Amino acid sequence: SSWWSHVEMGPPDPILGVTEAFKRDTNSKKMNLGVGAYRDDNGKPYVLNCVRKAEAMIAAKKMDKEYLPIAGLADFTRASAELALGENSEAFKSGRYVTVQGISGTGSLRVGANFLQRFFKFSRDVYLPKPSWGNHTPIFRDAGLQLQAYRYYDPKTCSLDFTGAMEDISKIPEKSIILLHACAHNPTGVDPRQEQWKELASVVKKRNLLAYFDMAYQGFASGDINRDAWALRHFIEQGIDVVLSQSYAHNMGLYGERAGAFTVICRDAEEAKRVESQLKILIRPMYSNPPMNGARIASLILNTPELRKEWLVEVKGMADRIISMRTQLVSNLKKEGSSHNWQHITDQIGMFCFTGLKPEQVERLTKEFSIYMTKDGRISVAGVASSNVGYLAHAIHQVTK
Amino acid sequence: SSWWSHVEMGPPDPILGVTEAFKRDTNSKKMNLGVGAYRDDNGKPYVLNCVRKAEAMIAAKKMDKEYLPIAGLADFTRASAELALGENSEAFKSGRYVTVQGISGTGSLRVGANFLQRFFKFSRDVYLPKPSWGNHTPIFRDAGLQLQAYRYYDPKTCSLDFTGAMEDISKIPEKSIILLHACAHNPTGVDPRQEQWKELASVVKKRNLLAYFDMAYQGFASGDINRDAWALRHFIEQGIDVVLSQSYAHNMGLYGERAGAFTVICRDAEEAKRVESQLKILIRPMYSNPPMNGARIASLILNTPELRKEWLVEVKGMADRIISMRTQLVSNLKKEGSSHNWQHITDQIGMFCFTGLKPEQVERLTKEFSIYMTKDGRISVAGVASSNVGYLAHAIHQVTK
Numbered sequence A, B: 001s002s003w004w005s006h007v008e009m010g011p012p013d014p015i016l017g018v019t020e021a022f023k024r025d026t027n028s029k030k031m032n033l034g035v036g037a038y039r040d041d042n043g044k045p046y047v048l049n050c051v052r053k054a055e056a057m058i059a060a061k062k063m064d065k066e067y068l069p070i071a072g073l074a075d076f077t078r079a080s081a082e083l084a085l086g087e088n089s090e091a092f093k094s095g096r097y098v099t100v101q102g103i104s105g106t107g108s109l110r111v112g113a114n115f116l117q118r119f120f121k122f123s124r125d126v127y128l129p130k131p132s133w134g135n136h137t138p139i140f141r142d143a144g145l146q147l148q149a150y151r152y153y154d155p156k157t158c159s160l161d162f163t164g165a166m167e168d169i170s171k172i173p174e175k176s177i178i179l180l181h182a183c184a185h186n187p188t189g190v191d192p193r194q195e196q197w198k199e200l201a202s203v204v205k206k207r208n209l210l211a212y213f214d215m216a217y218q219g220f221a222s223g224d225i226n227r228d229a230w231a232l233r234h235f236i237e238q239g240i241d242v243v244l245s246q247s248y249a250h251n252m253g254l255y256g257e258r259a260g261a262f263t264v265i266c267r268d269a270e271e272a273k274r275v276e277s278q279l280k281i282l283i284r285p286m287y288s289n290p291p292m293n294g295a296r297i298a299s300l301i302l303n304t305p306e307l308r309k310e311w312l313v314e315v316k317g318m319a320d321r322i323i324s325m326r327t328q329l330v331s332n333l334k335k336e337g338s339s340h341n342w343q344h345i346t347d348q349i350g351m352f353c354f355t356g357l358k359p360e361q362v363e364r365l366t367k368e369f370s371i372y373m374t375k376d377g378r379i380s381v382a383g384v385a386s387s388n389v390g391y392l393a394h395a396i397h398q399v400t401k
């Protein structure tokens, strides 16, 4: 008996673990449809054009590698707030916000949760949608808060249970915390309608709840970044001071570089200055200062007019491709002779499809076809190419037939 | 009264805050001797030659930016363990270790502390040397452990209080946790002698204490990396299963890229496999997966023979330069006419000098000469160039005169 004789074998991550299992298969037709990672039409990792050029400017410039302030690159930080808020926004304009570079979306989310654990004195409860991204639970749980839930998806109907959502939300206790996905809800791919959003705003406002927005997919819901930030902006303009986490992993394909941010909307710039100070104190003993490569690339794209415009064409091109794969999948299914209604596939937005396959079917897909996906029936359509869409549809059909 | 009306203005970081204050001064002769960051002889940020070439290979290769496993780049991870352990080591050879990429030294340290908080069932007390790096306190405190102390430095004598250290250590309760700096203790620049180390080993072994080693400066104590890893290796070969955190921020000048690692020495490779699994579960909800740029550069240097050999010449050159600045400082002091004994300056090793100036003198230095240093009298000699060593010595002299 040594120090760790009692430490048990823990299980593999429900999402991340999918790539580990995928890595090992020798089937040359294998497809990794687990994690949400964009693939180009050859079904290959895609580094955006603007990223490649950003990198080149960085090189050419022969920049140092000195430590960044605890809060991140100022240019990156100011530019992210602006991307979420919009440049004409009163909040942005008045400087009633504090944005801090974070370790991608996950990193930002945990900085937020930790912040909240420490300073949100009105409650310990965070309300998550049913269902929500698997990692939201443990993020809030490790930070020290309690998890609760509100109704959201209706599997019978493959859409939003708006009556249920509103019931639950109208009953959450005042001053509690509610988490909302800004756009391209994960994993359902179903977002509230503008009108629907207008109504949630009212109830949140009315019950005096802290709204925590998770904005991991800005530009993937419609293909337009301002349009994808609507609800978030609408909330702030209604007088709701939200907290928000942003990720650049998918919309800029910076996955492993880990670039993201966490923002707090405050009452004044003076308030923002004191929040900033406490966020630095929290981050110092966590990881000291954040990773520079992803933030330098992102800042350069966002702040360089030609790079930004190129970026936006690129985000549009990515979203479009996802659409075409959705379309073709459905068509292939009909073509294979599938009886089922696959309309939800083309109805859903974002990088995935919440298919509805049962765990026995998910299991067969992996073992007979070497198609890896999460156990809840979620598949990343973003990772399908023109060359294997046929393979996918045949498989889905066989296991469903 | 809004959400954060009660959040107070927190103070600036005792080290990191020095660079913020330094940034603002308009004095063209200002010197930032706060944080430990190497400067070349022109007093400029220095990106190693091998780093520059590593970067170039990476570019040329047109690598993707896909997410890395939760534990890091395998090549980086295997190579770090090896750099600390030595290639002939039984521990390394037998695979009785688990190494996980971490967010530099700070990141690794917190992963460790968090791990310990969760799995070290024999105690909540971490013993720190007096004095220790300021950030060790809050790292352990935020993770949820209790801090204790053992005697270490003797200001009267400007050296190690070995009798005191041993007294205190011989009385720490069995199965408690003790933190030791592998080499170039921060901030004293005084390390135990080999013989001294031999004696600490015995007492740690005897009281069955968990030894936690902080190895932030491998190659800066002597200019030789194997020699700097001696004590750490000696402990493991005596049968002590330590835990350790490594940083590549200074020895590879990867500061802002944040490359580091956390290792656990276990009884078997099977044990290592279960520890690994729990470390992944801890990291997933923290930052998901780590930053790739620093780890790719480091892996390439460590695993490419010519790059490694170049690296070692470079580490030696850096250490040598620090020595020459130490020498010249002392000489300048005599030359200026200083009565005091400045021998500790040349006696200390690593990037700093624990000068002994009082806070009123530190204050004057900043206001009259614009020389920034921490309030405990610690100065980074590593940041002195041939051109301002004279300025420094004159200043020190004026304020000491």
Ligand SMILES: Cc1ncc(COP(=O)(O)O)c(CN[C@@H](CC(=O)O)C(=O)O)c1O
Binding pocket: A015, A016, A034, A035, A036, A103, A104, A105, A106, A107, A133, A135, A181, A186, A214, A216, A247, A248, A249, A255, A260, B287, B288
């Ligand atoms: C809703 C949501 N929020 C935050 C994140 C955080 O992303 P990063 O930390 O990588 O910036 C993701 C990524 N969800 C992906 C990836 C994953 O789980 O790692 C998914 O497969 O659902 C996400 O879907």
Ligand SMILES: Cc1ncc(COP(=O)(O)O)c(CN[C@@H](CC(=O)O)C(=O)O)c1O
Binding pocket: A287, A288, B015, B016, B034, B035, B036, B103, B104, B105, B106, B107, B133, B135, B181, B186, B214, B216, B247, B248, B249, B255, B260
């Ligand atoms: C003893 C010690 N351990 C760990 C670290 C962690 O370094 P990174 O997180 O940057 O890898 C440092 C850096 N101490 C420096 C830098 C600092 O405080 O940020 C110092 O000025 O003491 C250190 O001195």
